[PDB]
């Protein structure tokens, strides 16, 4: 999906880890990493294994694709994407030498769609909607940008009352992320912007 690719690109631009995982709707998980292209290296030279809780360890079929380098990734079976439980991940070379090792909580690696329907009007009041098709909107926190000036919004709040200059065109944009403490993750893309000539 162009959505996974764009969200993966967003995460890959930030890291900080090499082995990156993100969920979109807390019922899914994709983990990926990037390395230099080696002529003899395909998914066969790596094993992706994981254990949830004390269940039998499982293997995940590795996929691969070029990038601007080579990206390996695995898409977890939905049955194994439960929240609030240790998901222990391992990537192991064919020799048995460990490559990556990470425990993650799915609820802590949320990457949402961007907010939609941004609108501004003169009272400058800024309003928007949460990412579409996203549960627990009451736990989504936001940040608006003015144009350079960043304003933080409390979770569940979808309005920002904004000092400015007269006869001025202001471009606004919003992005969203799951709010601590029960959830965490990464900033979405910025929303579609809007302009107001003050």
């Amino acid at each position, epitope marked *: 999906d162009p959505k996974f690719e764009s969200k993966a690109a967003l995460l890959a631009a930030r890291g900080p880890e090499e082995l990156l995982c993100f969920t979109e709707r807390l019922e899914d998980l994709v983990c990926f990493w990037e390395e230099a292209a080696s002529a003899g290296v395909g998914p066969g030279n790596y*094993s992706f*294994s994981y*254990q949830l*809780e*004390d269940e*039998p*360890w499982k*293997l995940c079929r590795l996929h691969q694709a070029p990038t601007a380098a080579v990206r390996f990734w695995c898409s977890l079976p939905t049955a194994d994407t439960s929240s609030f439980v*240790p998901l*222990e991940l391992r990537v*192991t070379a064919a020799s*048995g030498a*460990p490559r990556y*090792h*990470r*425990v993650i909580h799915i609820n802590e690696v949320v990457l949402l769609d961007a907010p939609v329907g941004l609108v501004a009007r003169l009272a400058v009041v800024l309003r928007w909607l949460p990412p579409p098709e996203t549960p627990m909107t009451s736990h989504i926190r936001y940040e608006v940008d003015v144009s350079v000036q960043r304003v933080e919004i409390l979770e569940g709040r979808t309005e920002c009352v904004l000092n400015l200059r007269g006869r001025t065109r202001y471009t606004f944009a919003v992005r969203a992320r799951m709010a601590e403490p029960s959830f965490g993750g990464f900033w979405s893309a910025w929303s579609e912007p809007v302009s107001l000539l003050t």
Partner: antibody
Amino acid sequence: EVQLVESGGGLVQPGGSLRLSCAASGFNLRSYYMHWVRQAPGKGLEWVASISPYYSYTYYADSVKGRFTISADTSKNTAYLQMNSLRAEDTAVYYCARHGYGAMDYWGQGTLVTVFN
Amino acid sequence: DIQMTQSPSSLSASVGDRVTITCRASQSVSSAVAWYQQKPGKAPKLLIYSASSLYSGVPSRFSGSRSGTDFTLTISSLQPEDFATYYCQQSSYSLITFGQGTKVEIKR
């Protein structure tokens, strides 16, 4: 339901050999990391070896590398520790343990290896 | 080679006391730290995993915490069955290592 039952410990000289067994019930041993951990008399816990699920990758403490071998037999649902080139530091109670919750959830009762010349 | 330095090596306390045991990693182990209880003649018992989650059946007076490479096991109100030796463990690397243990003895 889950049980680990060990055996094989005993008195052994250096230049002798021993094979420890760890028979599992209530779970498929091939589907888990299995660990061996030992405890010298009066001392703490020291990890010894690990074997990985499905591929059977093996990992060893430096002090046992090249002398001990961890392995597993799926048919008998059992893990093993083969011990050669034994030394006085090897005298200990050896536990086997299953990997779960990022740790060792289930443990055997231990079997004693005593080294003597 | 990650070192798990446990403090103190032993302590004495009374029933009802709040007991804190500390384990410091020589390098980052993320949150991959577990705590075990052991009594003479018995195998260790998993108490806490991922630094702060309680294993099933462990009573709620046991808690764990992480700050950086600093890991703490706390027993909020020591009970007679809690006198034992406690071990921390990191399993973030394939070379698993344990703390040296902390014996909790009976004060009198």
